[PDB]
Amino acid sequence: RQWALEDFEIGRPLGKGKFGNVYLAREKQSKFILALKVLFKAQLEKAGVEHQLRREVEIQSHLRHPNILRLYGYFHDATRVYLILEYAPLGTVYRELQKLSKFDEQRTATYITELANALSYCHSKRVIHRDIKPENLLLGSAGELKIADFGWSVHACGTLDYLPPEMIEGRMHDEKVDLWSLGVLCYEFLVGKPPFEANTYQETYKRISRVEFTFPDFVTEGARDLISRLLKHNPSQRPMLREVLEHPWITANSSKPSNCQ
Ligand SMILES: COc1ccc(/C=N/Nc2[nH]nc(C)c2C(=O)Nc2cccc(NC(C)=O)c2)cc1
Secondary structure: OOOOHHHEEEEEEEEEOOOEEEEEEEEOOOOOEEEEEEEEHHHHHHHOOHHHHHHHHHHHOOOOOOOEOOEEEEEEOOOEEEEEEOOOOOEEHHHHHHHHOOOOHHHHHHHHHHHHHHHHHHHHOOOEEOOOOHHHEEEOOOOOEEEOOOOEEOOOOOOOOOOOHHHHOOOOOOOOHHHHHHHHHHHHHHHOOOOOOOOOHHHHHHHHHHOOOOOOOOOOHHHHHHHHHHOOOOHHHOOOHHHHHHOHHHHHHOOOOOOOO
């Protein structure tokens, strides 16, 4: 399809990022509600990321999963690039965390199950995720989690909070990156901040490289066990997604079945 900007009525700004603004929008003919992400070419080219976006968009076009945000299409004019995206009405996990301070074990294990399901589906088709931040997790009409960043690779910053040691130490990274991501998110969901949070990039780099973190008292033995298994310095020592999905703390607390499958 040949989409142009006049094909859509543009509504309220949903959010802003470094490169793009996201707007609620509705396709004029069908009245289909969606989100339009608007990115400036000149800015993308200046940062050296236009190709990276192109590759991520191509990867994203292949992913069809209830817990992955859908890319409907794209287009451009002289100035900018427009991504036609699924509208996730309940907004970001980042914002939900800010409002609730921390999540209970049931919400947390349901979210981790949903992420593990989405990542399992991605791994099955040779697709790996880079780091996963709560700002880049959206919530659908029924509160289902949607991975919304296009941060994929067949094989292809920044705050360091969500990056694994092998990505910051200049090492080799594989499908085990997104296992680390699960460990960071599991901890952040339960505690209200990520495990290596610090005042400086420099303090954070060191905490990540050393895997230097501690649990507050309220974190239960089951959650500690899962988080400690995922946050291993050596990628090869991290579990398979199957193991995450079968973990007794996950199975006892999740509201959602662990569709591996
Ligand atoms: C109360 O403020 C909001 C409530 C809900 C939203 C939902 N946005 N949902 C989206 N659907 N599809 C896409 C793409 C988006 C999106 O990127 N939203 C977005 C982006 C950046 C920041 C936020 N902020 C919040 C608070 O949700 C939302 C956005 C703002």
